[PDB]
């Protein structure tokens, strides 16, 4: 029931500075070490640094030059700052809580709690809102009892897009495919759901798209 | 400066069989007691990392008995006695000994399940998109295995290349199936020019290529 929530800069232009902050709900920061771990295909899984409740920090040598770990026990939130962001700094970033036990040496019992993840994109492109188009059921979409419909998130920058069906009520058969990056530099994504064909017409299917970088939340109706 | 190299980069195991991901470090992770500073993490499809093994052999909380770490010194082996559908994802080994805190390459676990066939659906473009000046036709391949598939687009029986982008979901943690979405995009005028737009699907589970088509244009 421990929750680690991450927020901060999702889109940076090169040489600007990254801000990411993790708010811990459930436990005090006291008694643990707190680490920022990033994942990218270029860097793989990479340890950035850990922090104490006192304020003591341990950094990776490569990132030591431009990384500043902070903590505020009263507000129960720690932060990582990465300066002079380069194309190698574009990655998914996580905050983790170490579990440690002292038997004459601080032994580490693993990072029990991780965060949701915050994609950080390094690019000069401006934020563009997505276009939502309905993929509708038809004789071609239907296949016996199973019928297929969809929601198309056509053109958006940067990456974070969240799609839910029927305001979260419909998770049965909901497939949200990985986005594709077009030649135009913008992304494209499709989310689909397979329902019984009898449900068409009588039931009301809606797809909720939420692109927070552009502050664009649209609810689109899929009509057969 | 401690490098972690994992032996099997990708592994497909049948449900009920055993998997053995191996890890190796340049320098020994041993301490005075005999404990090793190695931890195993599992990143399921779409989720954040979870902790499996710590201190070489100790299971985390909520980690089933199947997962079992072992090994000492530089070589280490994570063993899963009975792989199940939920075990899908990429696995990592991490050293905590010498302050580089370096992970491993990664290792995808895939469930060797029954050969299945794609349920092919095709979606014509939206009325709103045509008004926007572009036209996108979607083809859907649902719940198939293996991952390998071919989705060719044919407009008026003319194969079209360079106008489509495809995306494949990861293995379903329940039925171990995949799904594919291909989107043919082109101009509004170019969509008025041709008549029939078909999506030809090739898969192992199918006897012959399956084609689906809509004819308005």
Author numbering:
A (entry chain A): 1 to 224
B (entry chain B): 1 to 217
Study text:
While the primary way out of the HIV-1 epidemic is an effective vaccine, the development of such preventives is marked by frequent setbacks, largely due to the inherently high mutation rates of HIV-1 genomes and the immune evasion capacity of the viral envelope glycoprotein (Env), which is the sole target of host humoral immune response and thus the focus of HIV-1 vaccine design. Despite its essential role in mediating HIV-1 host entry, most antigenic surfaces on Env are either hypervariable or cloaked by an evolving glycan shield. Here, we present the cryo-EM structures of Envs from two Asia prevalent CRFs (CRF01_AE and CRF07_BC) at 3.0 and 3.5 Å. We also solve a 4.1 Å cryo-EM structure of CRF01_AE Env in complex with F6, the first bNAb from CRF01_AE-infected individuals.
